[PDB]
Structure formats: structure tokens, C-alpha cells
Amino acid sequence: MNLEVLCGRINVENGLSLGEPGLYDQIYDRPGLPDLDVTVDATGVTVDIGAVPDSASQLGSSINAGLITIQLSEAYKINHDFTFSGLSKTTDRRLSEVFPITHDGSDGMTPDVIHTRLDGTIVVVEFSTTRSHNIGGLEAAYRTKIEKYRDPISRRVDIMENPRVFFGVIVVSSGGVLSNMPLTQDEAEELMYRFCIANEIYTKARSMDADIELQKSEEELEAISRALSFFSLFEPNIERVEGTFPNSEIKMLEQFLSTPADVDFITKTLKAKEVEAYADLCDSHYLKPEKTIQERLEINRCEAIDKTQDLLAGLHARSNKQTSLNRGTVKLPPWLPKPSSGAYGELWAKCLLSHETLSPFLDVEDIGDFLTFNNLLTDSRYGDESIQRAVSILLEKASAMQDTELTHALNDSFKRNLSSNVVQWSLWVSCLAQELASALKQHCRAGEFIIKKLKFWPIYVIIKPTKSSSHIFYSLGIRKADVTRRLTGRVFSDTIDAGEWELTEFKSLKTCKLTNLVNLPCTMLNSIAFWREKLGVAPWLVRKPCSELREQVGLTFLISLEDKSKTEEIITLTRYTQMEGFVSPPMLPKPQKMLGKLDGPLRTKLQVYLLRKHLDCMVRIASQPFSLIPREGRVEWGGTFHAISGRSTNLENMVNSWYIGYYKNKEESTELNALGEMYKKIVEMEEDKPSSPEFLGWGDTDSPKKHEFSRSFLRAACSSLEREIAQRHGRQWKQNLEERVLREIGTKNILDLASMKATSNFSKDWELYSEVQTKEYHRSKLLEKMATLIEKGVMWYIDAVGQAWKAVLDDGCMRICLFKKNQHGGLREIYVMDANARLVQFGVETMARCVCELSPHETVANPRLKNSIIENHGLKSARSLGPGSININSSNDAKKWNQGHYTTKLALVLCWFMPAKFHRFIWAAISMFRRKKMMVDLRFLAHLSSDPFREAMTDAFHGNRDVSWMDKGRTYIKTETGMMQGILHFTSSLLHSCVQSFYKSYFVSKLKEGYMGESISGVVDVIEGSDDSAIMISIRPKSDMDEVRSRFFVANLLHSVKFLNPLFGIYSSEKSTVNTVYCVEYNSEFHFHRHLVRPTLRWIAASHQISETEALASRQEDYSNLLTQCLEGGASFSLTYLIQCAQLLHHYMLLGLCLHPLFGTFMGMLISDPDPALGFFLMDNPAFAGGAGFRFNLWRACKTTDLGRKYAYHVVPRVVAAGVYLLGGSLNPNQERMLFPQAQEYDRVCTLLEEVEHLTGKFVVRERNIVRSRIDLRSVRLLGAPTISQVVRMNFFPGFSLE
Ligand SMILES: [Mg+2]
């Protein structure tokens, strides 16, 4: 290459400059590494490098073949020298000659390249290297190299007249190249290729002489010698293991490594599991004898009608067959007063002074119209009364730091959503649910009634708590003359009448549904402000509800008031029904596969409505797909529609329709229904153990039997990943690995163990039920298990293991406990281990995380990749195919990941990537999992002692019918199979990559031989994390009629994955689209060829969590962090502000806005002093509304107002009761620099935003495609079309240009 043209790319204007850091990743495919013969002698290093095999990529021409030498004086820096040989115009020009001398000590320092231009501009070029695989080091070395010369260069140039100097740095590794100097990609790829062969030789010769590494650390050396003496003196009694834990025999491992793989048995099976597939495509897609594409969609249409009628019938046969019912979906009455400031009649007067399932035909027409015409969004009159005036006061004060026109234009829109009536209704509910939750735990005198009058409103309550503290009974009454308006619907509860009063019927409410009634008024203002932007209206206009909006704010109001699972489930299951329809011609959409998961017993008048609307979406899709329209160079899809209420919309409007019931929680709800379910999902495949340990690691099979695998494959899918590691990194990857592990286990201290981690107090004592009762459990933390350890003289982690392994072998189990939150799907179960077992399991993680971290696909240890595989597939395919090449991908799933994996094959698949000293250890840390014992709640055991699977448990108890997973009398549940969730998180993801690299090498060898004997041309990519995956195949067909035969051929390859999986022990699911064209979907982000769609509504709903923190002003660093999550999810700068004002209303309502009798004081107090840590809410700036964090806002208020001078020196109750109980006139630029470190940078921002303070713009349309793009200032990524003045102008509202 050349070094002068490269310097001729950069242009500096005046003063000093650095540029912008840019990263090039390894994208293009390199060739094989050349033969290396290295011989170190007394004279020096003798090197022999052969001739690299040729590539069509044309890399490796730079390195020249032959024999050379390096002097032993310069062997310690071979890596820095061999790589940059060409750019090494070694002239050794000092800085004292070309620059002034100001006595800064840098005069002697000589950069590696100095280039002087004719005009006078100078470029300062550097060169560096790194050996780490973490992209933190690639930035660390760059930043320290910057600091190496930042100060003296400035000190010298400030004296200079007519100044122009640039600092240019390069950092190269085999991971990625980070540079601030523009290059072509190829010129970074060759740098990486050369670094490979440099480091390989440095390692090879490093072994012979110890003085070469004339460095390292005096302390680091101690750690390696500390953690090397353990793995040679540790000794677990083998013959005592094989007797205790059922299937652990050290002979099985010594036969896995040594015996080779049976190739005469592999090539036969792949030929029988193939013709299975091709004889199943033609049977279920109607390909024989021959039929036009128009006739086949007519056979498919009539098969989808049969299956749905046999489902509706069987659900009718067992049901109290009726066609009428008087009920209400909203158990609360419709009332709407004006905020101010028959034994039931006598009962009120006194204190004043089933189990059957409905039928799928029920005449649900009440609900069918409340969605079209409803009185929910008509502005009620009294938008100026007590409660709304008390909020207008606390919004002006916080918004005084800015006073521009954007603010008065966005605070007069929010004050228009707070006045509609669906919010004015929701404010007197969410105040009632703060009384019921308050007096939930209180005193009971048999026959007690408590009376309470709601403030702000003329409504009365009557509580009556029971001893269960899991129920409560109320009833409300009003004067019948104050009820002015009502909410105009027939889905409501019917109120008893009195001549002068109106009452209700003493209903009852649980106590898990009270965190959901308090977050009501805040999740409405977010659902009005999200669906008025997607449709097209603007915040500063007025309109009429366009009747595509009544249904979405109407439907959200119903699912969130009937709080049940199994009704928020027939919606989220509409995602795999509609996602079929993107499927390509040689196949047909088949959404009938979702029957099953759709046969449950209905129990309301809503789940009947959502079920009939869902089936007619299955019939319409099965009859025609979403059609393709390739107008521009881009592609578009036509015919999309909403699911529930048939409509027509675009993509983003559909993709967000899924995710209508999502919401998160962490409260660990307890109810006998929920807990009884978890134990059902744990013991499912326990009675299906094969009971003949010959196919669990000893031999081969063809037809596995639901827990088994074939060993001859696990050797052929491990040794196919090992090649792909040996080429990206250099050969001899093993020793270097051994170093990383040892230093990592050695230096781990006992003073830094993750505390606050819960553990389990389960032992022999808690084993018989009768004798242990009325005796609470109360599991404890981990901080106290570090106590008794330091009290015996142990400060290094690797010394507390030896006592922790014997404390298990003398017991015989794991002693686990259980814990479960309530959020309707996600990660709802948590498995807690005792303390003697977290120590033996900490070791097998650092041993197994350092091997994932050097793999190309796997995306859970190296997070950077998730993005860079699917975007960099276009370019890599274009280069070796030439434009005009199609894309045919898929996206998969696994059904039972845990509960389905034997715990061998996770110990055999790891012991292959290990250096033969640890084999005795890990094979003994695993095989601790083949006998477990899990607790069962006590309240669960009580009710059971005195229909499906519950009549089996109480049967297994009491000494009746024998079962294997439980025992008689004892309080626990045995098990002998399967990993658990979150315990073996990292070794199990390593077994996924050993598989996916078996396909990527199986498909590639199949494309190489065509069907007639030709050869297709293609490019195969694979990516996969813990459970998901994807595959992407691109081809280039020469002529027509070969585009038709080469697309039928691929369709099988992606289809036959379903049959080849059970040979490794993985079971494919029925939620895995197959053979889509131009669209893929990896984790939750859908890539529609050129448009990236990301579901926003998921992050808007999970934006106001009950803040469980002690000191105020530590809440606001959460609140202001659940905000930058949404903005990166794709949301305007004008909406992200209207989501902020809703956090405010939530905040002050926790300090007691409508619960406490004295709030004028705490309201009149904060107006005088506005500091946080007393309870003031610092608001953002209208534009740039979620970019800069909390600091920026604390600093933009630190230099304007009173804060300056002062700075010159249940769950709902205890969040409130801790809340209200705790209640020179400037700064010199030297102390501010101490406090706010970048206070010199913020002003580069604060001066730009004061240019756009006025509301003026137009309407445009541009580029119709979106792309993730990185912004730097803190770093935040904003979704936008392909600076700060440009982003702030485009992202204020879609289709609008500010200023
Ligand atoms: Mg998936």
C-alpha cells in the first residue's frame, strides 16, 4: 500500500483536531494461514513463511514468502513491527525540529510517521496493537494513546501562529480495527490478516525463552501460581461419586475423546432423514400431480373451515347450553360527579346516622358496538376544578427554566388530554384503590364497618375486612342529584335504587388486582398520545375522533379492567397467525397450526368475543397472502390489516397491534392457582425417562426416544466449530486461553461477591410436614455467608471451594427453593440455590464464558454482533455474486429448552475445549445436577392435605397411588433430569453454536453439487443466541426456468431442519416461520428488507414502575432512565415529552396528592425551594427531550436559579409511608470542573438548542426507509433515515421539518 495517499485523505482547518472514532469489523472472508516454522537460537529468531494458498478475494499478496531473521534484541516487540512493515518509512524524525520547543518533555518523543504537506498542514500518525477480545480494550488503548500526546501538542501549538495539527491513531487487532483516519475496508482487512501471522509467531517463540516477555506484573504472577496449585492437588473421591449420583462414570469420558467418528453411519442417516422431508412437502402442500397456484389456494381455503368448526363444536358439547346472560365486564358503576373541594337500604341507613363454562354462541352484541360508538373522548366541561387546578400549579413552576413557544404549545396539549372524561372517570377509581389497599391490613372486631368519604368528590365507601387478608368488601352510595353525566355504555354494573340514593351490591375484590388499579390514569394518557401520532394528527391541533381511534383507545380500556390471563393471551397469540402470509410461492401460508393453545374453557363474555374475531383472521389469511409490490429499488407489501377489528393500515401500525396487553411487575404474587401451575411445568417429562442408559452417551441410534442423543454426531458437531475458531484467531488458540482462565479465577477476591442475592434455608430439618408447621420459612441473603468465611482466614475465592465441595458430597442433593412474580409471560420463575452450591458453580462459568467469547455466531457473550450480522450480509453477498441476487431466509424456535436436556452432553461438549487439567473438576461439578430436591409452599400443602394434576398430587400424598417424582409424607419434589433456568446459562448456549455450525457446513457442501450435476452459487449465514436463531441464504440464478428450479431446491434445505434436530436433543416448535423472502426476525426486531420495524408500545407501557428506593432524588435517576429506553425504541422528540408529563402526575400521587389530608403545605413548601431530594421533578427541554441524562438537567438548573446559592456550601403503602415521613451566589469554573466534569462540553449543546425556540415549519416526505444510526455526545442511538442540528430538525414529528 502507500502512506502518502492515506495522509492525503484528511483535511484540518485551524488549530488542533482529532476527528471521530470509527470501527471496521471483520466482514470479508480470509484464506488459510501459511505454514510457519520458527526457530529461536542464541543468535536470534529464524522465521520461515510459506506461500499462502490463493484466494479470489485477493488477500495476502502483501506478505512475501521465504526465510528471514529477526535480531534477539528486538524480539520482544515483533507484533508492533511485522504488521506495519509497508507503512514503516523509518526515518526517525524528532518533534523538536519541525515544532517550537516549550520545555514540556515531549521533545524527545518521536512518532512513528510524520508527514508534512506543501500547504503547511501536518498529520500525526500513530500505530498500536491489542491482544484482547473485548471491544472495551480497543477503546481504552485509543484513549490512553490520545492522552499520551494531547497536552504537549496543545502547549506547543498555542504559541504557534497559523496553526493546523491533527492527531491520527490506528488500533488493529484480529477482532476489529478502530481508526479516526478514513480507509477503504480492504485496507483494514489486510492489516488484520497480517496481525494474525505476527501474533502466532510471537506466541510460538514466546515458549522457548522466558526473558522475551520482559514484562508482566509482580502481582499477576502470584495469581497464576495461586490458581495453578489448586488444579493439581484437588482430589474428589471418584469411587464415592459413582455410587452417589446415578449416572456418572469416568470411563464414559475417556471413550468420547479417543474413539473417532463413524462416517459410514452418518452418510446413511442423512439419506433417510432426507426423503422423509420431500415426501412430506408434497403431501401437505398439494404438489401432486400438478395444479396451478390458483387452484391450490382453493383447496387450502376449505380445509381451514373444517378444522375451525370441529373446534367450535367440541367446545359447545360441554357447556350449559344457553344463549343469554345478564352480566357486566366492568364491575364498577358509571358516574361522573363535579369535583367539589331489602336489608341494604337499612344497612346503609343505619351507619349513616356456577363453576360452569359458557358456549361459543352467546349473542355478544353489547361489546360489539361499545367499540364503535362510545362516549370516551368528548371533552367534559369541568376542565377547571379542584383537582385539575392543583396540577396546573405544579406544572408551571417546574417548566419555568424554559419559557419558549414550544413549551406553551405542548403544555396546552397535555392539559387537553387530562380533561377528557375517560380520564376524569379514571381519577376517582385510582383514589379508591388507595383506600382499599391502605386499610387492607388492619384490626377486625366481628361485625365491623369502616366509613370513609373520598376527598375532591361526594362519594362514600363502606369497608369490611376479613381474616384472610386476601379479600375485601365494599359498596358505594351517592345522592342521585350530583350525578351529572355518565359514560354511555351497556357494559357496566347495575345499581340498586333507593328513592333518594343509589347503592351497589357488596362486591369483593382480590388483593393482586390493586397495583393495576392505581396505574390506571397514567396508562391512559400514554395510550391517547401514542395512537394520535401514529394516525397522523399533531399535538397542536384539534379534530374529531376518527373512528379508527375509538376502537384502540376503546379496546385498551377493556382489557385493562378485566384483569385476567387467558384473555390477554388470545391477543398476543395473533402474532404467529398473521406472520404467515409473508411465506413465498413454492409453499402456502398455513395458520391452522395454531389450533391447540386455542381450546380452553371460556369463562366470560369477553373471551368469547375475542375468540370469534380471531378465527376469521385465520380463514382470511389462509386464502391469500400479503402481496409484493417492488416499486423503487426498495420493496413494499400490500394488503395488511389489523387483527381484531378488520381494517386496513400500514406496517408499523399493524406490528404494534400485537403487544396490547403487555405490562411488567416484580411483586411475587401468591395464589393457589398460579403456584399449582409452576409445579406442573416442572414435572412433565419425568415419567418419560428411557430407563436404559445405553443411548445417553454410550452409543448411536436412528430414532431417538424423547431424551436421548447419538454420540457419533456430537463428535461431528464439536469438531466443526473448532475449525472456525482456528482460522479467525490464529492456530494455537489453546495456551492463550489457559492464561485468561487462570488469572481470572486466581485474582477473584471474597470481599466482592454479589450480595443481596437471595439464598435458601432448606435442610434435613424441613423435611416432614406434620412436625414442621406454623413455622415460617423466611429465606435469607448472601451477605451473611461471607461473614463466617472471613472469620477463618480466607481472602481468595479459590480457597473456599475445597470446603464447599465436601459439604455437598456428604449430603446428596441440591436443596433448591422457588419464587415467582406475576407479569403474564416472560421470565416468571426463579430458582434459588443454597450457599454451599453457588461456590462450586461460580467456577464453571468463567471456565465456560471464556470459550463463548471467541466464537463468530454466538450473541450473548459478545453483544456487539446482534446488529452486525444481518446488515453486513448485503455487502458480503453483493461482492461475490454481483447485484440481482435473491434472499430466502427463515426464523426458528425450540419448545422446551430446559426440562429436555440431559446433563451429560453438557459436560461432554465442554471437556473438548479444555486443556486436560480441569477434566477431573468440571466432570464433577456437573453430575451434581442428577439428584435435586425442591421445596413446596406450606400454604399449598395445607389446603391439599384436607381437577387435572391436582387430584394426582393429593393422590401421591397420603400413601395412595404410587408416583416417582414425589414421595409419601415428605415436603418436596424429586427430579433427575434437565437443567434449570439461569443456572447453566452459558454452557447451554455453547451447545447451540456447536449445532448451527453443523448446518452451515452441511448446506454449503450441498450447494456445491447441484441437482443435475451443476453447482449453485450462494452465501450462507447463521446467528443464534440462547434460544432463538436464524438462517439466510442468497442465490444468483442465471436464466429463467432456472430461477424456478433453484428455488424449489432451497425450499427443502430450510424445511429439513425440522427432522435433523432430534439427533442432538432439540425439539422444534410450531412458532417458527419458514421460507420468508426478503424479511427476517431475530430477537424482537423485524428487518423488512430495508425498513427496520421495532415494537415501541412495549416500552411505553413499562415506563412507570413502583419505585422501591429509600432516599428521594434516587427515584428520579430511575424515572429518567426508563425514558432513554423508549427514545431508542423509535419515538419522536415531541411524544417523548408527553410521556414525561405522565411520569410527573404519577410521582406527586405517591407523596399523597389524593390520599393525605394535608397537602397544601407540602404544596406551598416546594414553590419556595425547588431542589430535588425534597420532591421536585426536573423536567426536560421540549426539543431534545430524552437525550441527555439526569446530570445535564441538574446542571442546567444549577446555573440559573436558587439552586446555585444552596449548592455553595402491600407495596403502595410503604412507598408512601417512607415518602412523606422523610419530609458567592455562583460557582467558579474551577469547582464546576470538579463536579460536572464535561461542563465544557454541555455548552456546545446548550447553545444549539436555543436556536429553534420557535414553532414554524412545513410538511414533507422523504426516503421511506429507516436505519439504526449512532449518535455521540454518553452515546445514544436514534432510529432514523440514513450531527445534532439535523437530528433535532427531522425527529420532532414524522413528516415535519422544524425551522
Ligand atoms: Mg425466533
Swiss-Prot record:
Domain RdRp catalytic: 877-1073
Chain sites annotated for binding Mg(2+): D1028
One Gene Ontology MF term: metal ion binding
Swiss-Prot/TrEMBL cofactor(s): Mn(2+); Mg(2+)
EC number: 2.7.7.48, 3.1.-.-
Binding site for Mn(2+) 2: D112
List of catalytic residues: K145
GO BP, sorted A to Z: DNA-templated transcription; viral RNA genome replication
Binding site for Mn(2+) 1: H80, D112, E126
Co-factor: note: For endonuclease activity. Binds 2 Mn(2+) ions in the active site. The divalent metal ions are crucial for catalytic activity.
Regulation: Inhibited by Baloxavir acid (BXA).
Keyword Magnesium: yes
Subcellular location: Host Golgi apparatus; Host endoplasmic reticulum; Host endoplasmic reticulum-Golgi intermediate compartment; Virion
Record text on subunit structure and interactions: Homomultimer. Interacts with the glycoprotein N; this interaction allows efficient polymerase packaging into virus particles. Interacts with nucleoprotein N.
Misc. comment: Classified as His(+) endonuclease since it has a histidine upstream of the active site that coordinates the first cation.
Domain notes: The N-terminus contains the endonuclease activity (endoN). The central region contains the RdRp activity. The C-terminus contains the cap-binding region.
Name of the protein: RNA-directed RNA polymerase L
Provenance organism: Dabie bandavirus (Severe fever with thrombocytopenia virus)
Residues of the full protein shown: 1 to 1612 of 2084
